[PDB]
Design brief:
part of a larger assembly, 6 chains, A alpha/beta (363), B alpha/beta (375), C mainly beta (106), E mainly beta (122), C: 106 residues, mainly beta, 0% helix, 45% strand, E: 122 residues, four-stranded antiparallel beta sheet, globular, binds a molecule of 2 linked components (NAG-NAG), binds 2-acetamido-2-deoxy-beta-D-glucopyranose, Glutamate receptor ionotropic, NMDA 1 (chain B), Glutamate receptor ionotropic, NMDA 2A (chain D), membrane protein
Chain lengths: 363, 375, 106, 99, 122, 50
């Protein structure tokens, strides 16, 4: 019955509040219209976040939280999750810090994010490489949490795939720029397609090492996941031309569109709950005042949000909170050292491309 | 040269003794004057209130590191996760000492969490060693539907595949189901006779009752069980012959924190002369910038290795977890825990005590069992 | 480590003569200096702590002062018990000075 | 320079009674063998009373040679072919196999 | 009043091991650090180290690391120092002293009589 | 079956020699260089698994 949307200082608060209010009004009016309030903050401190959450909770038991951000810090993705584990208020991740979805979803947590999981990104990358008819891979990873799971997932996917990729031995670097054993590891690969897994600074270091070893030639193709190159505006000089990456940015969408979609998802979930159970679900009465461990005697919103359709968009979420049809736009590193859209994947989970092969200019 | 250390403890006597330990560690030769400062706080019952108070008190006091232990109520979950996220926002390295739950191992969630207590997943690394001494090849796994159980299963599968071997089967069950009789019944129709269990205490008791009522506790069966699934109400329903794991001084918070304070002091001493130093944020409010020296401090902590602690050598794994921990393999005789074998890492050394097996058999059984009923 | 230099090394004075001992450290130690008195064949006895306050029960003749790297101990009238070695020690480094003792003039 | 012992060389024993092996003597001209054969080594006895034998080289060729060449794509290891002078297939005499 | 009783003077051949005991009375043994300090004849004080009976932690001087060992007995409240690989320079007088726990401004409030250890071939 | 002759412009270059020594696939490799240059060439070959 009540929705709170938190946005950054990018645009005016009043216009965003008005458009969030009139979104559901102009399309599929809810029988119990939800009042939408807007909040704006230039900081994302955890104390500020919890104080704002408590203030919204005091705001007539806000049923749903839509959290946007202007920074790229991923720690807040966990910070909301803990809140989502105790306030029992569903939270939707929008463009900003909440975009990076890497934390495991607690069974008691109601946090869902619009970002695409790393497994989905790996599937998109392998499908794109299949489109390029590149059947030989080289997985170069580093010591970073979560990368072992990605290696296992991609190895299993290649194992049971009929493409028959010539997946060579996977080589990982224990330390960055060791100058003792990493040289042999980088010299052991003799393929042309390399999938990297490392941080942005580590990506710069490994690309510098490859250029010193001549591993960035015309026939060498580099495909990079989203987390390495999440910030498109920051383009280090060590990134080779023609590098292919995936992301989810506002090249084809907008922050207002994302928050409208999130509010639509929340309204559809509320309607589905009402169509089955008359009583409106409610969160905890108080912010933190309690004498027992938090619990949800009533039904949760998870069953009601599995099958959701909004203005013809299948923006459903899986059992792990991953989007069933994430956007995950695929971009390339242009010869002028810039990121341009070259493909889209949200079209029925099918990869698309503009058929521009010679992007790997010797620059 | 002023460095403050935050503490999130359970009882006041521990706070006083660890303040005394910090006072001892103040000079320790080399260090100058007041390079170390001691701050402490209690376990606030509410998780949100605890997360607010740890920032209001510790972070506001310019803490380079935060020490957190298990809650005073072991039966209640009361995870320190709220204090891990907030300090994880500023890349503040938090140091756990008695949180054995295998959730903090994945550092993508907890960015700056380091623990000197090995998790349950590392217990899987022990089990393969138990397979080496007794020549176990066929084996089956029972796992609760939890992230800790999945991590333990993945660790066990990776370690077994390192030897190009595969377990007979793995059965996944939800944490709280009562009708687990079907899983045990379908596991009975297998060649393997040794089961490794990874679940909660109530699930362990339920599986024990199901095995007792299905006559699965007879001679031939081997029950390798971890630390969490033997202690407590499990001992009510645990039959004789359980090969259980236990952590030597793992529950001893005093020794773990006394080693941790020294490790943190040594890491601070090493860090104060490495490169450019950026002070930690003064307060949680009004600061949205991560600590630049936070990752460097975390790397220094992970690279530290000192045997001066009373718990023996201290070494951190590649993911920032305890390495080479002393485990005790107990054999349940007359519902009494008896220390049978030790595990100082790499290899496991038994003792003169004879190991009994479920069903009253005093001789080591064989995992292989040719049923000869070929469907 | 902090190096302590004491001047004079040995003062061959008489009974009742004014005795001045100056102790200098290699670097700044604020006021973390302790002045002890030791006699041959006997354990050292603490006289001044924190380089500014005398130990309780010590004679009022002793006067300690100084700061930074330089500290001074003054005795207006040396007595038979005052004919002993004096040491300045830095607590933060546990470094003892060479020692200033009063010798019999010959 | 680098400590990595590997068993790249594989000792192969072959017989010449079936048509699948048509090994011939080395010709003094060309490359001492054709370019579609493999090297073979045999200790040829010089006299009935003396067991001394020189490791003479020959050009092994046939169906088995082609099979080995095809399998070398997957095995990726070199093949060292040899011939057994004592018996062709052997038999368990005094619990000792020959050939 | 703090009372410290030390063992008699000992003469040991080079390369052997020597153990010195110091019994404490009149104060809380666990609530005070016990410090071992040696002094050579006609030389300045040489700080060996200290030990806290309450926790058992020991701090040793960098010079003597690897050979010196310090232990405490709470049942009888006695400190023990063991030194191996004795050399001729080890001939000195050893003293046990008390230090307040949690205070870094009262070094060696009380001093023991001292025990003489002589390492020579005569 | 002689492959393409591959020469190194400068010794201890460690910039372009990697791909040059990677392009070879023959089991037999000849050398023509000074002993000091041969030391670094063999070290690089060891680093390349040759
Ligand atoms: C050293 O630690 C002490 C506590 O162990 C700090 O004293 C606290 O300071 C904060 C703010 O500075 C106050 O809110 C607390 O009330 C103080 N504690 C008590 C018991 O009063 C002290 O500030 C620390 N000093 C430095 C330089 O970090
Ligand atoms: C921890 O171990 C120390 C010595 O190893 C012992 O004195 C102390 O009582 C132990 N504490 C607990 C809670 O077991
Ligand atoms: C464990 O103890 C055994 C028995 O001495 C020893 O051989 C082994 O090296 C030890 N391993 C570790 C990691 O300490």
């Amino acid at each position: 019955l009540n929705i709170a949307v938190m946005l950054g200082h990018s645009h005016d608060v009043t216009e965003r509040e008005l458009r969030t209010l009139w979104g559901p009004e102009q399309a599929a009016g809810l029988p119990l219209d939800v009042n939408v309030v807007a909040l704006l903050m230039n900081r994302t401190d955890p104390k500020s976040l919890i104080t704002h959450v408590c203030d919204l909770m005091s705001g007539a038991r806000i049923h749903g939280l839509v959290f946007g951000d202007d920074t790229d810090q991923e720690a807040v993705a966990q910070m909301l999750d803990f809140i989502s584990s105790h306030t029992f208020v569903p939270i939707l991740g929008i463009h900003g810090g909440a975009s990076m979805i890497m934390a495991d979803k607690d069974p008691t947590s109601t946090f869902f994010q619009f970002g695409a999981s790393i497994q989905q990104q790996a599937t998109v990358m392998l499908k794109i490489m299949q489109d390029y008819d590149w059947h030989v891979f080289s997985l170069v990873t580093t010591i970073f949490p979560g990368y072992r799971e990605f290696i296992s997932f991609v190895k299993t996917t290649v194992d049971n795939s009929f493409v028959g990729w010539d997946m060579q031995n996977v080589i990982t670097l224990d330390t960055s720029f060791e100058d003792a054993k990493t040289q042999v590891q980088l010299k052991k690969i003799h393929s042309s397609v390399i999938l990297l897994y490392c941080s942005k600074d580590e990506a710069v270091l490994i690309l510098s090492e490859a250029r010193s070893l001549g591993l960035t030639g015309y026939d060498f193709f580099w495909i990079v996941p989203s987390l390495v190159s999440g910030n498109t505006e920051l383009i280090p000089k060590e990134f080779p031309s023609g590098l292919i990456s995936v992301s989810y940015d506002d090249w084809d969408y907008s922050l207002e569109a994302r928050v409208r979609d999130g509010i639509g998802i929340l309204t559809t979930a509320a309607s589905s709950m009402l169509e089955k159970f008359s009583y409106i679900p409610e969160a905890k009465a108080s912010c933190y005042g309690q004498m027992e461990r938090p619990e949800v005697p009533m039904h949760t919103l998870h069953p009601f949000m599995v099958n959701v359709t909004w203005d013809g968009k299948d923006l459903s979420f899986t059992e792990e909170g991953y989007q069933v049809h994430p956007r995950l736009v695929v971009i390339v590193l242009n010869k002028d050292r810039e990121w341009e859209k070259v493909g889209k994947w949200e079209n029925h989970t099918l990869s698309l491309r503009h058929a521009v092969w010679p992007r790997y200019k010797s620059f | 040269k002023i460095v403050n250390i935050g503490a999130v403890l359970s009882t006041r006597k521990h706070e006083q003794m660890f303040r005394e330990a910090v006072n001892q560690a103040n000079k320790r030769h080399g260090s100058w004057k007041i390079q170390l400062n001691a701050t402490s706080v209690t376990h606030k019952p509410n998780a949100i209130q605890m997360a607010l108070s740890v920032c209001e008190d510790l972070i506001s006091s310019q803490v380079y590191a935060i020490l957190v232990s298990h809650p005073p109520t072991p039966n209640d979950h009361f995870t320190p996760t709220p204090v891990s996220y907030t300090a994880g926002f500023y890349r503040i390295p938090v140091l756990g000492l008695t949180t054995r739950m295998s959730i903090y191992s994945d550092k993508s969630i907890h960015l700056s969490f380091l623990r000197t207590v090995p998790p349950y997943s590392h217990q899987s690394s022990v089990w393969f060693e138990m397979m080496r001494v007794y020549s176990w090849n066929h084996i089956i796994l029972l796992v609760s539907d939890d992230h800790e159980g999945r991590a333990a299963q993945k660790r066990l599968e990776t370690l077994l595949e390192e030897r190009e071997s595969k377990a007979e089967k793995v059965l996944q069950f939800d944490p709280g189901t009562k009708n687990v009789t079907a899983l045990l019944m379908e596991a009975k129709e297998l060649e393997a006779r040794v089961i490794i269990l990874s679940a909660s205490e109530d699930d362990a008791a339920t599986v024990y009752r199901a095995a007792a009522m299905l006559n699965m506790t007879g001679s031939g069966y081997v029950w390798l069980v971890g630390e969490r699934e033997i202690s407590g109400n499990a001992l009510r329903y645990a039959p004789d012959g359980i090969l259980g794991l236990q952590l030597i001084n793992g529950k001893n918070e005093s020794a773990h924190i006394s080693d941790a304070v020294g490790v943190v002091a040594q890491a601070v001493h090493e860090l104060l002369e490495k490169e450019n130093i950026t002070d930690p944020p003064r307060g949680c409010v009004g600061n949205t910038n991560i600590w630049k020296t936070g990752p460097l401090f975390k790397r220094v902590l992970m690279s530290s290795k000192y045997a001066d602690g009373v718990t023996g050598r201290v070494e951190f794994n590649e993911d920032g977890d305890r390495k080479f921990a002393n485990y005790s393999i107990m054999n349940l005789q007359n519902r009494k825990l008896v220390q049978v074998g030790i595990y100082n890492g790499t290899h496991v050394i038994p003792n003169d005590r004879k190991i009994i097996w479920p069903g009253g058999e005093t001789e080591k059984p064989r995992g292989y069992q040719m049923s000869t009923r070929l469907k | 480590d902090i190096q302590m230099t004491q001047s004079p090394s040995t003062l061959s004075a008489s009974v009742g003569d004014r005795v001045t001992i100056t102790c200098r450290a290699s670097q700044s130690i604020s006021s973390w200096l302790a002045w002890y008195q030791q006699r041959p064949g006997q354990a050292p006895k603490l006289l001044i702590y924190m380089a500014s306050t005398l130990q309780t029960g010590v004679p009022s003749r002793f006067s300690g002062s100084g700061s930074g790297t330089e500290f001074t101990l003054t005795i207006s009238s040396l007595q038979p018990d005052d004919f002993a070695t004096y040491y300045c020690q830095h607590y933060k480094s546990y470094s003892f000075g060479p020692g200033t003792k009063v010798d019999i003039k010959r | 320079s680098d400590c990595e012992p590997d068993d790249n060389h594989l000792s192969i024993v072959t017989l010449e009674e079936a048509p699948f092996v048509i090994v011939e003597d080395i010709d003094p001209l060309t490359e001492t063998c054709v370019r579609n054969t493999v090297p073979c080594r045999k200790f040829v006895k010089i006299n009935n009373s003396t067991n001394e034998g020189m490791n003479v080289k020959k050009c092994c060729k046939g169906f088995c040679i082609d099979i080995l060449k095809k399998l070398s794509r997957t095995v990726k290891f070199t093949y060292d072919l040899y011939l057994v002078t004592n018996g062709k297939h052997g038999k368990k005499v005094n619990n000792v196999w020959n050939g | 009043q703090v009372q410290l009783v030390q063992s008699g003077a000992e003469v040991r051949k080079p390369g052997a091991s020597v153990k010195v005991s110091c019994r404490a009375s009149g104060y809380s043994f666990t609530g005070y650090y016990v410090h071992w300090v040696r002094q050579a004849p006609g030389q300045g004080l040489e700080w060996l180290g200290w030990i806290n009976p309450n926790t058992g932690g020991t701090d040793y001087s960098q010079k003597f690391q690897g050979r010196v060992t310090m232990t405490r007995d709470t049942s009888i409240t006695t400190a023990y120092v063991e030194l191996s690989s004795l050399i001729s320079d080890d001939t000195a007088v050893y003293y046990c002293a008390r230090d307040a726990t949690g205070a870094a401004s009262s070094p060696f409030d009380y001093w023991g009589q001292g025990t003489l250890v002589t390492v020579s071939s005569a």
